[PDB]
Amino acid sequence: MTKTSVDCTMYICGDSTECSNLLLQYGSFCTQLNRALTGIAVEQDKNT
Amino acid sequence: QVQLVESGGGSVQAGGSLKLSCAASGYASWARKCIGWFRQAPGQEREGVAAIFDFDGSTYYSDSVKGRFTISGDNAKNTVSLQMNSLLPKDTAVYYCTVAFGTCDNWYRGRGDYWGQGTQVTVSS
Amino acid sequence: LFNGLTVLPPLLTDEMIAQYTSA
Amino acid sequence: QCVNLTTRTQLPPAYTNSFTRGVYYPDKVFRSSVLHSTQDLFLPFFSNVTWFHAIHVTKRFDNPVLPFNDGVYFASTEKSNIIRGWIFGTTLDSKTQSLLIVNNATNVVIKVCEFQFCNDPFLGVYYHKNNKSWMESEFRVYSSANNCTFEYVSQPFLMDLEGKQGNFKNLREFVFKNIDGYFKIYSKHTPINLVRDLPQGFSALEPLVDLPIGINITRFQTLLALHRSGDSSSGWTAGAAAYYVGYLQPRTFLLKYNENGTITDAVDCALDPLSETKCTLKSFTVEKGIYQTSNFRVQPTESIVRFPNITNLCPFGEV
Amino acid sequence: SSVLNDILSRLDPPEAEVQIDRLITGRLQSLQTYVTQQLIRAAEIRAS
Amino acid sequence: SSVLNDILSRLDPPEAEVQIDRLITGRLQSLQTYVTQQLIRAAEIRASANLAATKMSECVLGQSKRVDFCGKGYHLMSFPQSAPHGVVFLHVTYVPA
Amino acid sequence: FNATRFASVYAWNRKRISNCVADYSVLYNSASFSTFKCYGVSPTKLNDLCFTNVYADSFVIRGDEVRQIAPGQTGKIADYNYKLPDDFTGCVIAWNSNNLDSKVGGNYNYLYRLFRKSNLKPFERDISTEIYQAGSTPCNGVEGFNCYFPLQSYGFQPTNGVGYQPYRVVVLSFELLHAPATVCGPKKSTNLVKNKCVNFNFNGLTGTGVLTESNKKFLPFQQFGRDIADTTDAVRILDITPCSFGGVSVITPGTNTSNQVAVLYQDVNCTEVNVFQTRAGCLIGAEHVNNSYECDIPIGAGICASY
Amino acid sequence: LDITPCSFGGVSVITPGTNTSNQVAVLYQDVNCTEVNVFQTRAGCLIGAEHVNNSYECDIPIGAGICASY
Ligand SMILES: *[C@@H]1O[C@H](CO)[C@@H](O[C@@H]2O[C@H](CO)[C@@H](O)[C@H](O)[C@H]2NC(C)=O)[C@H](O)[C@H]1NC(C)=O
Ligand SMILES: *[C@@H]1O[C@H](CO)[C@@H](O[C@@H]2O[C@H](CO)[C@@H](O)[C@H](O)[C@H]2NC(C)=O)[C@H](O)[C@H]1NC(C)=O
Ligand SMILES: *[C@@H]1O[C@H](CO)[C@@H](O[C@@H]2O[C@H](CO)[C@@H](O)[C@H](O)[C@H]2NC(C)=O)[C@H](O)[C@H]1NC(C)=O
Ligand SMILES: *[C@@H]1O[C@H](CO)[C@@H](O)[C@H](O)[C@H]1NC(C)=O
Ligand SMILES: *[C@@H]1O[C@H](CO)[C@@H](O)[C@H](O)[C@H]1NC(C)=O
Ligand SMILES: *[C@@H]1O[C@H](CO)[C@@H](O)[C@H](O)[C@H]1NC(C)=O
Ligand SMILES: *[C@@H]1O[C@H](CO)[C@@H](O)[C@H](O)[C@H]1NC(C)=O
Ligand SMILES: *[C@@H]1O[C@H](CO)[C@@H](O)[C@H](O)[C@H]1NC(C)=O
């Protein structure tokens, strides 16, 4: 399929400096949801 | 923009006591002036009656008023009052609010002085 | 077959996946 | 009394390396064989710092005015306890409450007070040729102090004050911070056997004290000492000594602890992108392959507003 | 709104912070949703 | 505070009941997440285990004319051995030359 | 609080307070004052917590604006005289002094400011006396119009009304300054114990578990270190450890046979609550044997069970 | 006039392994590294590499046909 990746922040922050100060208040989700996608992105290239 | 709400005008027998007032409110004192009045005459010009340093005890007083009148005000209430005590008959004229500026001496001149319309104060007899 | 939603290119292309088959 | 020492040679400044200094335990926490990214003010690596000369040879005396913007890394290489303390503040002329942290032949001396710090402070030793002995004899740094709030002192002591010959043998490194109305001081003392440079390797700036002064330092000057044996402003000797200067900045760092609560290595998620990913995975060694660190964004310029062709103006002149 | 720069440009922080504190609480929920719809559809494709 | 106790001993129930109303929100939405990523994987193993269950039912216990299922080459046998958390299959084969 | 004279909101005096203790409940249970509004913490809780210092802050305003003394609350004074953050912590104390500070004429003493170019950041006092300027042309310094001195005098009257009755204010900062603890509440120390699961308050930090001897080293400033998740595991000497948390599985022949049952206990050492231990924990109600069967009921690690 | 978002994208770091060496190359996902040795690709721009016209098996795959190695 199409390897989709998303910058966890620009979705949540839209290029403020404020928001970024807050999403870091919500944990490390900007970290997980990436791996959870890459794990697909590379898998596929392997699937091929 | 600097208005001087006057109060206490009118006629009065010669030899009485009273409280006239001059008030400015919603103005945000910038920051503290002296405040007083003058006294013009139907024939003669105004006279230097007194002064008092806005939100401060320091004051001025005219030879006539200095003995039988006291200028007193409340910036919390945003007014002043020259107690019309002993009401000399010579006190027969319209009395004018006078906004002295940042300095207390300057009022002594009174030219740029701000004013209230003028409470006519005749001290009748 | 933009606002944070990107896409990646693959390690193999049409012409490269085509050759495998030819092979 | 304020005297202007001179016979001082003028010379542009020097510059040198930041081979992994200016790091410190940011908190008062402990850890074991763990790696923690403590985002806080630190020093940027492999950056530049300043040199200054206090050499016998000139007399090349360095004790100028300098800023305390957001952080300091002051260094001392010595053989005879040359560097004795500091004078901080914003005006120094006994107007604004200022600070000094001082170490005299008898006492550490620490006062947050309105000293009239004037042009050319110093402390001067006196050396006795009849009987070999160096002695404090001179302190002329300030002129006036009327009202002030805090000071602090230690138990007195005895200090060498004698000038030795040879190469630099002691690496001293101090720290100065202003935050929370406190004043965050750490330090380290390491010995070296160098000649003329700042050594390499790592070092872990343990804390000492955080002075609660709630003032607004903006600039400062340092306190070494002078020797004597010319005139009040000509008759003096400097002594072999030099310091170095760092300024601290907010950088995402990561600290290698031990089984001990100690620090042995650290890295920066911002210095050289290699390191940047070294955090993205949170380790000091990376395994072969690609890794995704950050996002690129340009930033804009020449903001604009362009509204309908105005070209029809309310007819005021017609009024 | 659904637009950030405005929300900041209309208020003061305190509510400008909770306003944003909600907007977040659905986006991350929006993302985790897409993700869990992108893992699975990336698991299936594997079985293919 | 990301701690509970430091909130239980610092404040009183009601606001402690609006704050704890939050620290719950995360300590759940962090879990319902985990379970998934740890459920899904729990299947990928299965489709990666069953396949590993078929080999020790096809390749080890016998011979299979299938290619690339019991290793590279015309299969001949398949000797298995263990692992900590998996299996290993040693495929013996026939490589012409 | 008994300080006769109080500085002015534009020079609001403040004081550090460490190396001491505070039977705060009095300030609450005196009730002699108007407001003791406590953000950040619970007024009725300040006996067990503690800190390293207290920035004691005192000023005076009209009760009319004590409401202005609120974090994120807008007020000219609160905008140009005294600022609080959006994340303050502490308690606000303010009380009438009409009885102690009023005098006929308007007590022209307690000076206060009106204007500024900007709003003050929290705790960022401003004493300035420069002439406030609203006109593009700088007076440089002739006060008057569009050139202003910035401060005005309340001048409280012996008669003035409530919103103009002068109320003294004191403001306390307890900013969770955790590194060392030096200023603390009233409490009676207690004797330490080990090897027994016990709740604790070590220098203000609540937890529970067992208390066993540390082997590591700290430094002359270090009060505690946390292993990961910010979980403290040592204090002032000791290392920490929870007390056992285990799971509970009940085992049976199936009801239709019996009502007798077995007790499973996970990853535990049943000395630490007949008996039997495994790599799965310990089992109460069964017997380890030397025979050999097929597995009907699994526990784990090799241990099954049946009749 | 058309409107468009000035360029964005992601960074990738190319490493054979600190267990070998320190050198590193930079990838900017899907960009023309005019907007910032050099190398261009249908994956972006690769900085710190040498456009070797040879052919080799893959160790570190960028994309669109390009791996990289040591
Ligand atoms: C060194 O010289 C400077 C001037 O070159 C001195 O600064 C003067 O200080 C006096 C009072 O101490 C002032 O009246 C002068 O206005 C200052 N001059 C300048 C240019 O600012 C300084 O005090 C001298 N320091 C010494 C002699 O130690
Ligand atoms: C170092 O500084 C301290 C602090 O000023 C000096 O100690 C004081 O000295 C004066 C003068 O002898 C005494 O009157 C004080 O009682 C001392 N205070 C102390 C010791 O706390 C000390 O003399 C300085 N060192 C030298 C060499 O002068
Ligand atoms: C710390 O001191 C500096 C002075 O060096 C202050 O900065 C000045 O601020 C005033 C405003 O009152 C400006 O008019 C000056 O132009 C500024 N000059 C400089 C050099 O900064 C600063 O505001 C002070 N900060 C604190 C927290 O006290
Ligand atoms: C630091 O600044 C100095 C300025 O004198 C400059 O010469 C030098 O190149 C800069 N960088 C380093 C690494 O020294
Ligand atoms: C700390 O490190 C030193 C090595 O410099 C070592 O000797 C010591 O044993 C370490 N600490 C402990 C508790 O082992
Ligand atoms: C259970 O505790 C006892 C305490 O004496 C110990 O001897 C035993 O080894 C423990 N069981 C284990 C570690 O399985
Ligand atoms: C990794 O570094 C160690 C250092 O001791 C070395 O022995 C080893 O050979 C290195 N690995 C490779 C693959 O070069
Ligand atoms: C690769 O490009 C170079 C020019 O930089 C060229 O000389 C070389 O022949 C090319 N390699 C081929 C065509 O295999």
Residue numbers in the entry:
A (entry chain A): 731 to 778
B (entry chain E): 1 to 125
C (entry chain A): 828, 855 to 876
D (entry chain C): 14 to 70, 76 to 247, 252 to 341
E (entry chain A): 974 to 1021
F (entry chain C): 974 to 1070
G (entry chain B): 342 to 577, 584 to 620, 641 to 674
H (entry chain C): 585 to 620, 641 to 674
Paper text:
In CoV, the virus envelope spike (S) glycoprotein is used for virus attachment to host cells and membrane fusion, and it is the main target of neutralizing Abs. The RBD in the open conformation engages the SARS-CoV-2 entry receptor on the host cell surface, angiotensin-converting enzyme 2 (ACE2), which triggers S protein rearrangements that lead to membrane fusion and virus penetration into the cell. We selected a panel of nine nanobodies (Nbs) from dromedary camels immunized with the receptor-binding domain (RBD) of the S, and engineered Nb fusions as humanized heavy chain Abs (hcAbs). Next, we used cryo-electron microscopy (cryo-EM) to determine the Nb binding mode to the RBD in a trimeric soluble S protein without the furin cleavage site and stabilized with a T4 phage trimerization domain, as well as with three proline residues in the S2 portion that enhanced protein expression and maintained its prefusion conformation.
The S-1.29 and S-2.15 reconstructions showed good densities for Nbs bound to the closed RBD and to one open RBD, but poor density to the second open RBD, so that, we only modeled two 1.29 and 2.15 Nbs bound to the S. Neutralizing 1.10 and 2.15 Nbs from group A recognized the RBM, similar to class 2 human Abs, which bind the RBM in the RBD open and closed conformations. In the 2.15 Nb, the immunoglobulin (Ig) domain tip with the CDRs contacted preferentially the RBM valley and ridge, but the 1.10 bound to the valley and the RBM mesa at the terminal side of the receptor-binding subdomain. As hACE2, the 2.15 Nb Ig domain held onto the RBM top, and its CDRs made an extensive interaction with the RBM. In the refined Nb-RBD complexes, the Nb CDR1 and CDR2 penetrated into the RBM valley, and the Nb Arg32 and Lys33 residues were closed (2-5 Å) to Glu484 in the RBM ridge, whereas the CDR3 bound to the ridge and other Ig domain loops accessed the RBM mesa. The 2.15 Nb Ig tip and its CDRs contacted the RBM valley and ridge, and the basic 2.15 CDR1 interacted with E484 at the ridge; consistently, the E484 substitutions to Lys or Gln prevented Nb binding. In contrast, the single RBD E484K substitution in the zeta variant severely impaired 1.26 binding and completely abolished 2.15 recognition; this residue is within the epitopes recognized by these Nbs, and residue E484 interacted with the basic 2.15 CDR1 in our modeled interaction. Likely, this is a key contact for the 2.15 Nb recognition of the RBM, as this Nb did not bind to RBD variants with the E484K (beta, gamma or zeta) or poorly to kappa with E484Q. Importantly, the RBD mutations L452R and T478K found in the prevalent delta variant did not affect 1.26 or 2.15 hcAb binding to the RBD. Notably, 1.26 and 2.15 showed complete SARS-CoV-2 neutralization even at 0.5 nM, indicating a potent neutralization activity.
